Design a protein around this ligand. Sequence first.
Ligand SMILES: [Zn+2]
Length: 71
Amino acid sequence: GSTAMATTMEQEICAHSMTFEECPKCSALQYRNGFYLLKYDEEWYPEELLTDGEDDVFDPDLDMEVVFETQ
Ligand SMILES: [Zn+2]
């Protein structure tokens, strides 16, 4: 194709919407779509994305305190 990585034709061809170059951004490797944070269909999607679950956790359970089952 063109002189681009992974023979990108610059016509946005991938499993997902973007180009091969933009595949990691498209979360092509993951096959889990990055956009739409609140995914009702997917389980604990915002939590998975969040580095720290302290804000998004109920009061009786503290992620910091318990090493196991940390979100
Ligand atoms: Zn892609």
